[PDB]
mmCIF file of C-alpha atoms and ligand atoms in Angstrom:
data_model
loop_
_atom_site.group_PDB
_atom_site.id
_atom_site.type_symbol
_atom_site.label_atom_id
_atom_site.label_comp_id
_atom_site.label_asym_id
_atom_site.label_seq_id
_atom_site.Cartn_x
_atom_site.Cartn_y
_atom_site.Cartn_z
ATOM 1 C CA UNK A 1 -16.511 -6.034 23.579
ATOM 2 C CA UNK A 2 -17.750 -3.320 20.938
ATOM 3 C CA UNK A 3 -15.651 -0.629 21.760
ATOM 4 C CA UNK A 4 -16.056 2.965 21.588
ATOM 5 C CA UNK A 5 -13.198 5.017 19.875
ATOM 6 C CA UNK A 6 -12.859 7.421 16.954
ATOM 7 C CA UNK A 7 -10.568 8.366 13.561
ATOM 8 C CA UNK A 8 -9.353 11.153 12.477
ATOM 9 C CA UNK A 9 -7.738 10.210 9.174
ATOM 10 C CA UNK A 10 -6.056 12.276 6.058
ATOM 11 C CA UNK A 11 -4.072 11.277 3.246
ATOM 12 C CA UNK A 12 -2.250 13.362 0.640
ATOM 13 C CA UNK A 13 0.001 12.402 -2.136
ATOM 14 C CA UNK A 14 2.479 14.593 -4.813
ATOM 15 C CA UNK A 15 4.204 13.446 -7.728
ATOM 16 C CA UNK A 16 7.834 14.775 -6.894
ATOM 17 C CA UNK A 17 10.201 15.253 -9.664
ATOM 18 C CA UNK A 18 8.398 12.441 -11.828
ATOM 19 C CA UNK A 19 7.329 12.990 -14.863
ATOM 20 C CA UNK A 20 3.710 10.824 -14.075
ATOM 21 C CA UNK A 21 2.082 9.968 -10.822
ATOM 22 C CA UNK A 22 1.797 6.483 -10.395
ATOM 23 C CA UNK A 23 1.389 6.524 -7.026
ATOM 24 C CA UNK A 24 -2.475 6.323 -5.914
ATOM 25 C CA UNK A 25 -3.664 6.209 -2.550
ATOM 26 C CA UNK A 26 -8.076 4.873 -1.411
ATOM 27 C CA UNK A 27 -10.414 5.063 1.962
ATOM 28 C CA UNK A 28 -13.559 3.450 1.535
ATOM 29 C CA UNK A 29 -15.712 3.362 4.305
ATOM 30 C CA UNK A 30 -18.850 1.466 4.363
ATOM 31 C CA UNK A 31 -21.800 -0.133 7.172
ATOM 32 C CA UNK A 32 -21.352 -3.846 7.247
ATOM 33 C CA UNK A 33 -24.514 -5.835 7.783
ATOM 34 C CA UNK A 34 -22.311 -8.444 9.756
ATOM 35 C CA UNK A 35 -20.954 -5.902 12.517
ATOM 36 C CA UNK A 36 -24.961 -4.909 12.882
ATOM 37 C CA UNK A 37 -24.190 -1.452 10.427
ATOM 38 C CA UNK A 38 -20.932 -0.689 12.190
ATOM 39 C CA UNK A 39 -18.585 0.707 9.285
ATOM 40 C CA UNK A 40 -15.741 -0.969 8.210
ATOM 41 C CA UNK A 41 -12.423 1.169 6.875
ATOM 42 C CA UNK A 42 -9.858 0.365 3.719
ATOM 43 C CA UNK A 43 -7.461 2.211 3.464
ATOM 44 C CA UNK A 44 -4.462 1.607 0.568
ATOM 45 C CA UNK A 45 -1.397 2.953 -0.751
ATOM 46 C CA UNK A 46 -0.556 1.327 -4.237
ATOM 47 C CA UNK A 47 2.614 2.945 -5.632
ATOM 48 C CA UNK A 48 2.634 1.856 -9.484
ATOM 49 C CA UNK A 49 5.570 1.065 -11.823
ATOM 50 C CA UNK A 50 5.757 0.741 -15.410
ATOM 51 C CA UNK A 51 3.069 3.162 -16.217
ATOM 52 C CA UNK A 52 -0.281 3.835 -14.387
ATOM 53 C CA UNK A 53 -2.599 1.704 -14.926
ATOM 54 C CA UNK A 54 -2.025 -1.096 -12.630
ATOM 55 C CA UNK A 55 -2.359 1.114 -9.652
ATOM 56 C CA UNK A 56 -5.433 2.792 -11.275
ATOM 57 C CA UNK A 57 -7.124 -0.658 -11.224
ATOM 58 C CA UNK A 58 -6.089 -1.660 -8.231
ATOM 59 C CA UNK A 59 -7.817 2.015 -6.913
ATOM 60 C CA UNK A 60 -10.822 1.141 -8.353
ATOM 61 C CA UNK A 61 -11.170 -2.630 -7.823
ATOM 62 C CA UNK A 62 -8.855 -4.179 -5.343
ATOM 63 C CA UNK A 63 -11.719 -3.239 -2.273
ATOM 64 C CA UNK A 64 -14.809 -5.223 -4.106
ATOM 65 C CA UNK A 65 -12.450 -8.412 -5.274
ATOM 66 C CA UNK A 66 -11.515 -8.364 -1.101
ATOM 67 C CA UNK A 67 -14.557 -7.759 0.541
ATOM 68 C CA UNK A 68 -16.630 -10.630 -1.978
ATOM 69 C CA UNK A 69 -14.431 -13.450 -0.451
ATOM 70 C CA UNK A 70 -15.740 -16.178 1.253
ATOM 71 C CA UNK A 71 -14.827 -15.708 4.773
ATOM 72 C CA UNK A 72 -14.587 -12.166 4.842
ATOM 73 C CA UNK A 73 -16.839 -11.045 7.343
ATOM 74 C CA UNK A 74 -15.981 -13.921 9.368
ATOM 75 C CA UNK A 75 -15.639 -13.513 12.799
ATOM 76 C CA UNK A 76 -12.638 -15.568 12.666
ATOM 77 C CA UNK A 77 -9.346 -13.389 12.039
ATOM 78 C CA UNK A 78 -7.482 -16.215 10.083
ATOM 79 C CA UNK A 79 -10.461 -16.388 7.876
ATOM 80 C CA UNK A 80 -10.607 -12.908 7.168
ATOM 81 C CA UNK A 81 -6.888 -12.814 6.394
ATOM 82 C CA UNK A 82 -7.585 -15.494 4.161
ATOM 83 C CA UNK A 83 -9.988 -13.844 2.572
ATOM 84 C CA UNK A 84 -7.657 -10.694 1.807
ATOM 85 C CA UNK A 85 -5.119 -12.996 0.394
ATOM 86 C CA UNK A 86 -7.789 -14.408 -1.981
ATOM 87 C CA UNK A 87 -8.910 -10.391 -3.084
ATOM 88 C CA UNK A 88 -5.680 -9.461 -4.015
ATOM 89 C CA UNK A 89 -4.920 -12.810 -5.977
ATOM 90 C CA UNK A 90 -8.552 -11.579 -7.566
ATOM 91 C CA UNK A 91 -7.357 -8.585 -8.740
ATOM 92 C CA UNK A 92 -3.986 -9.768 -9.969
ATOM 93 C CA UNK A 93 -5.732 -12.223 -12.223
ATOM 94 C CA UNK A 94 -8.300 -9.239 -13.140
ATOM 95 C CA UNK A 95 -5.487 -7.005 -15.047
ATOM 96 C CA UNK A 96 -4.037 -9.862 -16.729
ATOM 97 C CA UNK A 97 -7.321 -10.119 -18.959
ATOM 98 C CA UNK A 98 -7.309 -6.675 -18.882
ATOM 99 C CA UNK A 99 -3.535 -6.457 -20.300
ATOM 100 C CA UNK A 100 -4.524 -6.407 -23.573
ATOM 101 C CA UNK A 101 -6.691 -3.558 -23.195
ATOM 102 C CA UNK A 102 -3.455 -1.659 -21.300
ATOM 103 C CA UNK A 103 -0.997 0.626 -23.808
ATOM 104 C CA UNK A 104 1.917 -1.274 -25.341
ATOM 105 C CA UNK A 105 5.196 0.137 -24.404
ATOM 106 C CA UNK A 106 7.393 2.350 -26.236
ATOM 107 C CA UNK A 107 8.430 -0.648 -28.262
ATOM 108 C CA UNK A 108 5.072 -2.566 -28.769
ATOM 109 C CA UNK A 109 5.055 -4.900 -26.432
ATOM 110 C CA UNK A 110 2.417 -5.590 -23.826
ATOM 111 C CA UNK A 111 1.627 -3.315 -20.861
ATOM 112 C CA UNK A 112 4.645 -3.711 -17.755
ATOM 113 C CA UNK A 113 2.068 -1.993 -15.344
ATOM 114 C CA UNK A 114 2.354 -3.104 -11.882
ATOM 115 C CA UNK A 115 1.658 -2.013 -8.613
ATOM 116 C CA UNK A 116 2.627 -2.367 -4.859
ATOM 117 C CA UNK A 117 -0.547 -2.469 -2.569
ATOM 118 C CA UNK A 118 -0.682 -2.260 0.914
ATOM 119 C CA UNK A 119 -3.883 -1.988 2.926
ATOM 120 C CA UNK A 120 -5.194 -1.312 6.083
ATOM 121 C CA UNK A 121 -8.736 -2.480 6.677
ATOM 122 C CA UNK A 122 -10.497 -1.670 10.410
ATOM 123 C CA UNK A 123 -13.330 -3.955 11.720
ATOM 124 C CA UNK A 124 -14.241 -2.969 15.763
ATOM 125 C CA UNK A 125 -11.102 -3.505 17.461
ATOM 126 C CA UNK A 126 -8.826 -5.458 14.629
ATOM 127 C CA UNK A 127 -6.565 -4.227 11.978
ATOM 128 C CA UNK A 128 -5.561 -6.269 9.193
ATOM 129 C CA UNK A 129 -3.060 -5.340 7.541
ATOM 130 C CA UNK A 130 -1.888 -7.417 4.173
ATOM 131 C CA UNK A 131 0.804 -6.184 1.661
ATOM 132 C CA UNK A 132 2.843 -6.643 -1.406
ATOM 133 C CA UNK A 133 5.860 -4.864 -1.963
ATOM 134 C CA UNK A 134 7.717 -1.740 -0.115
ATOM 135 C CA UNK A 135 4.855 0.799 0.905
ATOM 136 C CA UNK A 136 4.895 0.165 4.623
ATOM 137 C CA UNK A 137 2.720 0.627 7.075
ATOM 138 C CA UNK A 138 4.009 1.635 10.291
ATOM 139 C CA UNK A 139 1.494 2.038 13.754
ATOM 140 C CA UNK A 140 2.532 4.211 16.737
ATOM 141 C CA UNK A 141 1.809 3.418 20.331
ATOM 142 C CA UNK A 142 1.900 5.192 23.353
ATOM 143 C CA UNK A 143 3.203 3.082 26.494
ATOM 144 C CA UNK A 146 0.784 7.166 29.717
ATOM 145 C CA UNK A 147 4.431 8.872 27.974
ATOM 146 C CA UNK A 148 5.038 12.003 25.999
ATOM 147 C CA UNK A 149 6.928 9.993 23.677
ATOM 148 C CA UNK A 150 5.056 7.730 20.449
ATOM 149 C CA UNK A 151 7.153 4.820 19.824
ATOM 150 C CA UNK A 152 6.861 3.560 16.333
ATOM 151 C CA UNK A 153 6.703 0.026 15.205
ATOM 152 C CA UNK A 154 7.206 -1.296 11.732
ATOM 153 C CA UNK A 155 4.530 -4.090 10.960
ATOM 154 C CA UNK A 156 5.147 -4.942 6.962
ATOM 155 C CA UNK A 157 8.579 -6.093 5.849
ATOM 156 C CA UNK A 158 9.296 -4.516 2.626
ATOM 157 C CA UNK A 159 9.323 -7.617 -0.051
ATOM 158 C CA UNK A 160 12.430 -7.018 -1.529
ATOM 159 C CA UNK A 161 14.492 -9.314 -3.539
ATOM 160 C CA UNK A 162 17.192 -10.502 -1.968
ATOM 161 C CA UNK A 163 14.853 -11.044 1.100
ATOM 162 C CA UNK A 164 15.857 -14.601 1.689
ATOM 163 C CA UNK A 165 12.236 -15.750 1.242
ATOM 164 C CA UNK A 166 11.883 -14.016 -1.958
ATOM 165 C CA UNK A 167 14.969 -15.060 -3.427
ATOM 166 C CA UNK A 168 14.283 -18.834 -2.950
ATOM 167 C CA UNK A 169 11.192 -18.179 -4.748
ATOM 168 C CA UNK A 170 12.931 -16.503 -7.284
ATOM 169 C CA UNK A 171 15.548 -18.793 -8.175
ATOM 170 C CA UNK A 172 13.476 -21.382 -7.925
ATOM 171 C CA UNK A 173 11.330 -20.351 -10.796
ATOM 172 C CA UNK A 174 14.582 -20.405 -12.594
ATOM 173 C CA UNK A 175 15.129 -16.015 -12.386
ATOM 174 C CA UNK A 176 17.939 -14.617 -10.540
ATOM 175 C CA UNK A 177 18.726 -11.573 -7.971
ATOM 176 C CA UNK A 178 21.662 -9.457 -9.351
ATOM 177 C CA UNK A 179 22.707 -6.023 -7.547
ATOM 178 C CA UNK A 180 22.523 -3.525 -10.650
ATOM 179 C CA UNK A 181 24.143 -0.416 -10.022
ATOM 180 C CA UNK A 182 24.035 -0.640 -6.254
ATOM 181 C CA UNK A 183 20.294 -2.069 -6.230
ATOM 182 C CA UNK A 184 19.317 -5.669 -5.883
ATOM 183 C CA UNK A 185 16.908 -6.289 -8.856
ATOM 184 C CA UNK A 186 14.492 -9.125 -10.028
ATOM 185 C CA UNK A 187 16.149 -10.248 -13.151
ATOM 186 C CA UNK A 188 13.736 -12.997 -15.201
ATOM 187 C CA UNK A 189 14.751 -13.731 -19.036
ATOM 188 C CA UNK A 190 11.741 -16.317 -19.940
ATOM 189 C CA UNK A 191 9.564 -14.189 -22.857
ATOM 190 C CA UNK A 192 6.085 -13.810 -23.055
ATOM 191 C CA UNK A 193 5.825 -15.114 -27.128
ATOM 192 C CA UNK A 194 2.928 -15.209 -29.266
ATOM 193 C CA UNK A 195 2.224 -16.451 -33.060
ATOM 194 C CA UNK A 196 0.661 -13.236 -33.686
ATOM 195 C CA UNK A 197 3.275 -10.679 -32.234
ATOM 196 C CA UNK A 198 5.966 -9.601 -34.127
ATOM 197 C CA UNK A 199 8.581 -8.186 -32.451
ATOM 198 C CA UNK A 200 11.776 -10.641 -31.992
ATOM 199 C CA UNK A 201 12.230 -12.926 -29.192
ATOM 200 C CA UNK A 202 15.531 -11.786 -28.379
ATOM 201 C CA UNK A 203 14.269 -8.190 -28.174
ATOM 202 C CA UNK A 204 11.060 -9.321 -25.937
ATOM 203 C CA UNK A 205 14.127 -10.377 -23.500
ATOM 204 C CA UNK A 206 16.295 -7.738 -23.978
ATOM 205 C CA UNK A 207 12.816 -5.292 -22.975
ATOM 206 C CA UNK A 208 11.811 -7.187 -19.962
ATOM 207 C CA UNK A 209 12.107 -5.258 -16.931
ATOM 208 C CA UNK A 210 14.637 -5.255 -13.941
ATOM 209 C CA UNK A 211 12.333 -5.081 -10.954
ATOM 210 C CA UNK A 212 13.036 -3.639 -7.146
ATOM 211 C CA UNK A 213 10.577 -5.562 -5.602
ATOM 212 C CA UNK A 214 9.720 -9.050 -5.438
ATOM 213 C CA UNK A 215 6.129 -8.910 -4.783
ATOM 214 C CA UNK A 216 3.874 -6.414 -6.709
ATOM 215 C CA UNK A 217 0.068 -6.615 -8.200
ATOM 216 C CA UNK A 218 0.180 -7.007 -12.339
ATOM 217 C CA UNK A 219 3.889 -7.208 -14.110
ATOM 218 C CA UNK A 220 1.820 -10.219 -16.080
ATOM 219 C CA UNK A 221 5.755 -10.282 -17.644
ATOM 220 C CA UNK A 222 6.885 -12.011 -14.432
ATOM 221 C CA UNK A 223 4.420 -15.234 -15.426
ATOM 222 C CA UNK A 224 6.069 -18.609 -15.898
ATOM 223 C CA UNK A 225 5.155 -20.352 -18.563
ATOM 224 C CA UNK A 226 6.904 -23.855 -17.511
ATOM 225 C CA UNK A 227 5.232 -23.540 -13.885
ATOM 226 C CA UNK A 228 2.508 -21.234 -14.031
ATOM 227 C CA UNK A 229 3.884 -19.169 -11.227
ATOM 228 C CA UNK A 230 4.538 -15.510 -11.288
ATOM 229 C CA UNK A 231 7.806 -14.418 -10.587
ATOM 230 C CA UNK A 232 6.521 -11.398 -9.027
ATOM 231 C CA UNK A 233 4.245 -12.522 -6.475
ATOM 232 C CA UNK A 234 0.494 -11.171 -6.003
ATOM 233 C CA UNK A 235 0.156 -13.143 -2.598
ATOM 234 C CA UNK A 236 0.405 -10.352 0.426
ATOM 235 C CA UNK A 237 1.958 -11.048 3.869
ATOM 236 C CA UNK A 238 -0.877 -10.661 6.069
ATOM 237 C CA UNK A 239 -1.271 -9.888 9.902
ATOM 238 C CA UNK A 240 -3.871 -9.048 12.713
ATOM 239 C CA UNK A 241 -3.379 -6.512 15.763
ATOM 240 C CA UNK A 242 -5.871 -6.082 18.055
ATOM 241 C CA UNK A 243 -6.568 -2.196 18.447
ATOM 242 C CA UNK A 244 -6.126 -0.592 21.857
ATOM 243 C CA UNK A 245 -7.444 3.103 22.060
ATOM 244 C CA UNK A 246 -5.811 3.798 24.805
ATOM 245 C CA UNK A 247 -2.327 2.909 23.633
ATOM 246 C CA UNK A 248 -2.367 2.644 19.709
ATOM 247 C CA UNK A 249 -2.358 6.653 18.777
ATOM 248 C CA UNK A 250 -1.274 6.436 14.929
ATOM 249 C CA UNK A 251 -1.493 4.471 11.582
ATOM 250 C CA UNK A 252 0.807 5.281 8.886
ATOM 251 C CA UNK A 253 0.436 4.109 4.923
ATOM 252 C CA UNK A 254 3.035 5.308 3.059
ATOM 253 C CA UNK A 255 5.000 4.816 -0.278
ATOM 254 C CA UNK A 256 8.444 4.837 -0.674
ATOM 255 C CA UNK A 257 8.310 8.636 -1.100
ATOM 256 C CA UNK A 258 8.028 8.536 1.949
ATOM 257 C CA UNK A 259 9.834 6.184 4.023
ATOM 258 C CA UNK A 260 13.224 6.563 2.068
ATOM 259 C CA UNK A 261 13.454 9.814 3.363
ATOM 260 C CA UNK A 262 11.638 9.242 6.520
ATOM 261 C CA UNK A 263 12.631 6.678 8.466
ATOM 262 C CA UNK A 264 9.582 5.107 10.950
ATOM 263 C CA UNK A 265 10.245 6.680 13.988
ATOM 264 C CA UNK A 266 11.219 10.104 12.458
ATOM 265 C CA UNK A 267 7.360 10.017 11.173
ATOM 266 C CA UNK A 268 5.753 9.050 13.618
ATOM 267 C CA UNK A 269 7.414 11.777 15.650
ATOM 268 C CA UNK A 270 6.368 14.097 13.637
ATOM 269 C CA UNK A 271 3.345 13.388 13.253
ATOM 270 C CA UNK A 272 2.637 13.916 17.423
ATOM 271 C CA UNK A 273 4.523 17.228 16.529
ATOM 272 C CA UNK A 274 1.854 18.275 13.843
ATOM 273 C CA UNK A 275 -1.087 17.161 16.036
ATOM 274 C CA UNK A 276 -0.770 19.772 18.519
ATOM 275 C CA UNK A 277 -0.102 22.348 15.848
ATOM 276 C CA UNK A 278 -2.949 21.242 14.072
ATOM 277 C CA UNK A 279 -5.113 22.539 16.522
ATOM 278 C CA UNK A 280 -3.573 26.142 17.069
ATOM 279 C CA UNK A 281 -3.837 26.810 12.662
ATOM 280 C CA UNK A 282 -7.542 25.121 12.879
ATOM 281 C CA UNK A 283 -8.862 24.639 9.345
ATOM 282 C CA UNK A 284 -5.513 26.106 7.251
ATOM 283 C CA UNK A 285 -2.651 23.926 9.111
ATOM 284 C CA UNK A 286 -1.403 21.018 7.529
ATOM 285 C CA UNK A 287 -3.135 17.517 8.311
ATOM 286 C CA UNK A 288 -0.296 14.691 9.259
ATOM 287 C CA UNK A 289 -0.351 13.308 5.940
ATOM 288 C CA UNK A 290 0.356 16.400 4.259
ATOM 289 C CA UNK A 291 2.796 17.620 6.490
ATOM 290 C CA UNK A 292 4.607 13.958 5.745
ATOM 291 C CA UNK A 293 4.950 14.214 2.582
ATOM 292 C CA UNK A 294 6.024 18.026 2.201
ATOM 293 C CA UNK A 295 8.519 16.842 4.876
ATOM 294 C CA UNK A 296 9.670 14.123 2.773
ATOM 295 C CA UNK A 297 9.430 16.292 -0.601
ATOM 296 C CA UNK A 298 12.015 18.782 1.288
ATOM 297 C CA UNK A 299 14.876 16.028 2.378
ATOM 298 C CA UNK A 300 14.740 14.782 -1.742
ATOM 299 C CA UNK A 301 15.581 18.330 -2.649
ATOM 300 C CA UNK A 302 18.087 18.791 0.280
ATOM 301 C CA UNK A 303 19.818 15.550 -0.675
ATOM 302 C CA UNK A 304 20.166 16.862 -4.188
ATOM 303 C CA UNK A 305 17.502 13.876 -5.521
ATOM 304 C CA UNK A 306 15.037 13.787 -7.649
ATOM 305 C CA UNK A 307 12.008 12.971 -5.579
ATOM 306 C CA UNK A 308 10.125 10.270 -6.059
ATOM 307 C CA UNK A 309 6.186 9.944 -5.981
ATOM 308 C CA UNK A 310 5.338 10.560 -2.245
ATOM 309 C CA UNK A 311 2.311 9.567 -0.545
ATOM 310 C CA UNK A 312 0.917 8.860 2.534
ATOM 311 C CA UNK A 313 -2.032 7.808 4.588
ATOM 312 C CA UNK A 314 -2.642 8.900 8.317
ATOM 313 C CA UNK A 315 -5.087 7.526 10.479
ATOM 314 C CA UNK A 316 -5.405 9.448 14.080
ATOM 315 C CA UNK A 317 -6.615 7.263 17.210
ATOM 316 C CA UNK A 318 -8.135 8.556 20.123
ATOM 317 C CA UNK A 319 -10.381 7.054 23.186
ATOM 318 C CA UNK A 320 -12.523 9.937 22.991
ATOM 319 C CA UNK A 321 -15.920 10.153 20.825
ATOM 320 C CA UNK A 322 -16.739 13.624 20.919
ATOM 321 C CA UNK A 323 -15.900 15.200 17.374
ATOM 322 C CA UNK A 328 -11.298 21.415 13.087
ATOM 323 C CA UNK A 329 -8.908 20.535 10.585
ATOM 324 C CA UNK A 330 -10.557 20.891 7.284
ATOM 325 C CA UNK A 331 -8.414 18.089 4.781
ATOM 326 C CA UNK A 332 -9.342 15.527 7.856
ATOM 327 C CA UNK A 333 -12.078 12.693 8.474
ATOM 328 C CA UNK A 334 -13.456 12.234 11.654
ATOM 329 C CA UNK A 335 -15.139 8.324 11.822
ATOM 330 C CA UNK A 336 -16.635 6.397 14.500
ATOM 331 C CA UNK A 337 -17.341 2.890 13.272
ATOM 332 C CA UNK A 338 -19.955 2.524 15.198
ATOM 333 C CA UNK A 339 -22.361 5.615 13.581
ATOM 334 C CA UNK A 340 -22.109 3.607 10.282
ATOM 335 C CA UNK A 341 -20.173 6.761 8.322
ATOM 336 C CA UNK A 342 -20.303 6.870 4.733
ATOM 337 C CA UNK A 343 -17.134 7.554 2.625
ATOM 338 C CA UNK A 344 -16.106 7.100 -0.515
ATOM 339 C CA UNK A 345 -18.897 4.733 -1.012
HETATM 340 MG MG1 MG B 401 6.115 4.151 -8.535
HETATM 341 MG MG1 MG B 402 7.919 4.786 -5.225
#
């Protein structure tokens, strides 16, 4: 059952109309001794909040806390998932002993940094996918046809997902639609003896998130139950790749997918791949024609864009390798990347 297929993968990312980028996208590709040197593939979108450096850390460490798990390279798929729950609970706990190391905001109070995550890692024929937050990850799959359907396989965490908001009010914080947005709102202080700044202005400073699951926003811990409002633990699910059928992956931040719905992108990108091929090395790859495409509806919509970024991952039966911004990977050659 060790299949033969190839990747073709690109990613590009622009900061909009923000002032930082926050967003940060990772492919890390690397032999594993388990699969006999056949490569295994992370990919990650982490779109940051509340200044950079949670996403920054998550770029540069949220691959080695997953892949040191017990269970990881299990053959076993709910042991691997497992596994990738554990990694990202890893890293969480990571930045909050790095928090005080992190600036202090504009009014001297601890480091708000937080991150969405959302990661795609690809062992033989599985994909694992396991997120937190609202950068989704969408597949497309042809059922012969001329037509790529796309299907949506993360459910953005928001918070007045019922779920979430259980979880939320539980912990004693509420969900309150602020100017047309549901928001995490959570009025418990982080207090020191050492700190000065006044209680009632630690409240009055924490923040009013839009998603209910994120990596870091330490602000979100509960001191009565030791929970974090703003939960590290990702949704996690298995698909079993088909070559013949499963044509696209698509990482993306919110850039990106609230100005392009799923099957919008995922028809464009089977638009750009035969173009891709008549402009050779200077056309755009998928990713970066996604994200101009997304950068043009902010400005047409009279928006100011957000952070866009996105990560495309090109499936195909064949194994026989002109775009220039794209990687070509077959697993089973154990490729080097990023690592
Ligand atoms: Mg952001
Ligand atoms: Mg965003």
């Amino acid at each position: 059952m060790a299949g033969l297929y190839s990747l073709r993968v690109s990613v590009f990312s622009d900061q909009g109309g923000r002032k930082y980028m926050e967003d940060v996208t990772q492919i890390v590709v690397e032999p594993e001794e388990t699969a006999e040197r056949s490569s295994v593939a992370f990919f990650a979108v982490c779109d940051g909040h509340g200044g950079r450096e949670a996403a920054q850390f998550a770029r540069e460490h949220l691959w080695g806390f997953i892949k040191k798990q017990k269970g990881f390279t299990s053959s076993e798929p709910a042991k691997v998932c497992a596994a990738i729950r554990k990694g990202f609970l890893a890293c969480h706990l990571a930045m909050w002993k790095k928090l005080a190391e992190w600036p202090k905001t504009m009014t001297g109070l601890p480091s708000t940094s937080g991150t969405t995550a959302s990661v795609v890692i690809i062992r033989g024929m599985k994909m694992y996918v396991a997120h937190v937050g609202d950068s989704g990850v969408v597949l497309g799959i042809q059922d012969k046809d001329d037509f790529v359907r796309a299907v949506e396989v993360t459910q953005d965490h928001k918070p007045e997902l019922p779920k979430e908001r259980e979880r939320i009010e539980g912990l004693g914080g509420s969900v309150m639609n602020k100017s047309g947005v549901n928001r995490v709102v959570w009025k418990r202080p982080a207090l020191t003896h050492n700190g000065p700044v006044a209680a009632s202005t630690v409240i009055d400073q924490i923040p009013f998130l839009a998603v209910a699951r994120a990596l870091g926003d330490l602000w979100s811990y509960d001191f009565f139950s030791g929970e974090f409002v703003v939960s590290p633990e990702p949704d996690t699910s298995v698909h079993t790749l088909d070559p013949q059928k499963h044509k696209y992956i698509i990482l993306g931040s919110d850039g990106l997918w609230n100005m392009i719905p799923p099957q919008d992108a995922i028809s464009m990108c089977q638009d750009q791949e035969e173009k891709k091929y008549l402009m050779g090395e200077h056309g755009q790859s998928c990713a970066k024609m996604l994200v101009n495409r997304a950068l043009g509806r902010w400005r047409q919509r009279m928006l100011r864009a957000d952070n866009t970024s996105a990560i495309v991952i090109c499936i195909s039966p064949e194994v026989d390798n002109t775009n220039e911004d794209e990687l070509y990977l077959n697993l089973t050659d154990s490729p080097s990347y990023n690592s």
